Structures are given as structure tokens and as C-alpha cells.
């Protein structure tokens, strides 16, 4: 159904996902005092935009990897009702598999 394994790619730089997440947290932690919340319809700040982009990329990578943490995925990746639909679909699937495995074991 998928096809051929995609052509191999060589990383330009070496870094772990955990290291990247830690670096992102460190970067966003220093601006917490400067960071100011605002209404959703109001214009965003530089810190908010950076946080949204970084978290979106990080959680997209995590969801592709397999770390299905719905609580943060629904926050840092949902920007289209399509994404809410996808989150709901994924939420049902994980719970269904967990229940099926439990009863198949029982």
C-alpha cells in the first residue's frame, strides 16, 4: 500500500529529540516574565509565535514517532477543525486498542 522505502537521508547535524526539547524549554523559560497572554483574536507576540512554531514541530515529530500524548497534541497542533477531528479519531483508536488488548488478555 505504501510503496518503496524512501531514499536515505543524511542528517546535516547530530542532535537528539530529547536534547532539542530541553533546548526549546530553556529558550522559552527565560522569556516567561516578558511573555504576556492575550485574547485569541488579538495579534500575537514574537514569543508566542516562536513557542507555537517550536511546539508544533516538536509534537508533530512526536506523533509521527509514536508518543501519542493527546493532551499536548490537541493544544500545539490543532489549528483547523480538521485537526480536532483527527485528534478525536486518534483518541478513539488508542482507547479501542487498549481495551481490545486487555480483554484479549483476560
Amino acid at each position: 500500500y505504501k510503496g518503496e522505502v524512501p531514499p536515505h537521508y543524511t542528517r546535516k547535524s547530530s542532535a537528539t529529540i530529547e536534547q532539542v526539547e530541553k533546548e526549546i524549554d530553556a529558550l522559552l523559560g527565560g522569556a516567561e516574565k516578558l511573555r504576556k497572554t492575550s485574547t485569541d483574536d488579538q495579534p500575537m507576540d514574537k514569543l508566542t509565535l516562536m513557542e507555537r512554531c517550536l511546539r508544533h514541530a516538536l509534537w508533530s515529530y512526536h506523533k509521527e514517532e509514536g508518543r501519542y500524548d493527546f493532551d499536548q497534541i490537541g493544544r500545539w497542533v490543532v489549528y483547523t477543525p480538521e485537526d480536532e477531528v483527527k485528534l478525536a479519531q486518534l483518541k478513539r483508536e488508542v482507547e479501542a486498542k487498549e481495551k481490545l488488548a486487555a480483554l484479549r488478555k483476560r
Binding site: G30, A31, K33, L34
Partner: protein, 87 residues
């Protein structure tokens, strides 16, 4: 607060100048005398109107010092002379 000067204005009113948009406007509706943000900018009316900014003691949340890598640019050339050295 000190008696030091500030960004020069040239005796011009920034609420009516041809480049007024380049000067931020505060809550009171008075455009700043400089590209910076000024809360206590005022206008005085002599024969001509002119903007003024009074320095004051104000605390601003200071972002932590970044690394030298991300703001230093070592593109200096023999002919280059800095503004401080020129002064």
C-alpha cells in the same frame, strides 16, 4: 534621575511630521521622540509645537543576557571605524 540628553528631535513635533508613523504612539496619543517606546512623551506649544521626553526611573523586565555567538558579528574591516571611536 539624571540630566543627560536623549535622542535628538531637531525641534520637530512627531505627531505632524512627514515620518510620524516611524515614531511609536503611547496610550495618551503622543508619538515618541525616538524609535523607542516612551510613556511620558509630551508636546509644548511655543510659536511652533515641539515634542519632548522627560527621562524617568522606570523598571523594565530585562531578558537574560544571550550568548555572544548570536549577536556578535566579526566582519570588522581595517577601514571600519565605530561610531564611538569616531566620536
Amino acid at each position: 534621575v539624571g540630566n543627560g540628553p536623549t535622542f535628538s528631535t531637531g525641534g520637530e513635533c512627531m505627531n505632524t511630521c512627514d515620518i510620524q508613523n516611524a515614531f511609536p504612539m503611547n496610550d495618551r496619543g503622543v508619538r515618541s521622540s525616538s524609535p523607542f517606546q516612551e510613556p511620558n512623551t509630551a508636546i509644548y506649544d511655543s510659536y511652533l509645537a515641539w515634542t519632548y521626553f522627560q527621562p524617568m526611573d522606570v523598571h523594565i523586565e530585562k531578558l537574560p543576557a544571550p550568548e555572544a555567538k548570536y549577536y556578535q558579528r566579526h566582519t570588522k574591516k581595517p577601514w571600519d571605524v565605530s561610531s564611538t571611536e569616531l566620536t
